[PDB]
Amino acid sequence: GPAMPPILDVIVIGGGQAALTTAYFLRRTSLSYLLLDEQPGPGGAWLHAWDSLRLFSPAAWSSIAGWPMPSPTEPGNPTRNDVIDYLRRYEDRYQFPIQRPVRVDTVTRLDDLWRVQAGDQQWLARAVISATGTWSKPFIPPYEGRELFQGAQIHSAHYRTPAPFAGKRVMVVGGGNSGAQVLAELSSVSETLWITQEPPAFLPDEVDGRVLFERATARWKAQQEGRSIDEPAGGFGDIVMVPPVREARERGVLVAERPFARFTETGVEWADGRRENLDAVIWCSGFRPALDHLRELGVVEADGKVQVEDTRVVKQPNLWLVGYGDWTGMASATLIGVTRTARSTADQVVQALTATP
């Protein structure tokens, strides 16, 4: 049968939801393409989510393009394992060209093509779409004295179960949905403190993450009609009152302080005299984009982000970034929201590559 094409039209780097949704749209084109994903099997970063994690909206509101997420038969929003299974079944449905396990090291512009390199294995492509997520680049803010702290430090990226924290005094740093959920779970076994940059904001009890998607969509539509609305703010990471978080609220757990000033050997200290000893800190302080494979090109800013117009990289030809965060399209880092930019990305790749008869 035919060899792999010496030049692929498109390489997609990654194999999670964003890559798959991009693959869905590429399948209605005539372009040759290939997905390269570093893990042994399907599931993207959901493989690394903590054991109890569930989505903040129902299945219907957590679907990527095409085949929708099966409704769970047990009560509650889809679990981590539900998402993994969804993605696994979605790949089985469409038989996308995916190679695993392939860790892309770099991307090199050579002659007017992209050379994509994973160790020994290299491919050439006319276009490269990066959809590598964020989980592999946990971010911790640069607080003084962290190196001195003698208790446990872990990022949420590495959290799985609350067991080893039981009976301890634990600080959760970071708001949003992740902070609130991790805090809620830790508080069931440990004495907790929550640190957030701003006072946390909660959605009403009767609503779900579809509200956050609406807000996102309203923002991009305004960014694109008569563009305005600084007031009110987006509240784009207001907290959804998922069951464990609603239970935490009843126990008085959802109260936060503003950031401390430094770490000591035994805990933290604020500029105003607050001083708190801690056995462990769980950093729910977010992530940077997983763009190490673009560093040699020089496009990754001090931010860790890259200058883009929607998903198109500004400084370089025929490169797109899909699904990383609002900075690559409002709501693009969610199951429901990635579709809009995966779709428009595929159209832009077509526009760049299709040739007259």
Ligand SMILES: Cc1cc2nc3c(=O)[nH]c(=O)nc-3n(C[C@H](O)[C@H](O)[C@H](O)COP(=O)(O)OP(=O)(O)OC[C@H]3O[C@@H](n4cnc5c(N)ncnc54)[C@H](O)[C@@H]3O)c2cc1C
């Ligand atoms: C704790 C948590 C809770 C969340 N809750 C929700 C929710 O309730 N609802 C919702 O819609 N979204 C939620 N999200 C957000 C978003 O949907 C997830 O972050 C999701 O994993 C993003 O999918 P992605 O495809 O962009 O990235 P990923 O799932 O990270 O997929 C990227 C894939 O590319 C691979 N890869 C990375 N670098 C390379 C490389 N160099 N070469 C080859 N492969 C590479 C990765 O290993 C991975 O398999 C949550 C995220 C987190 C962290």
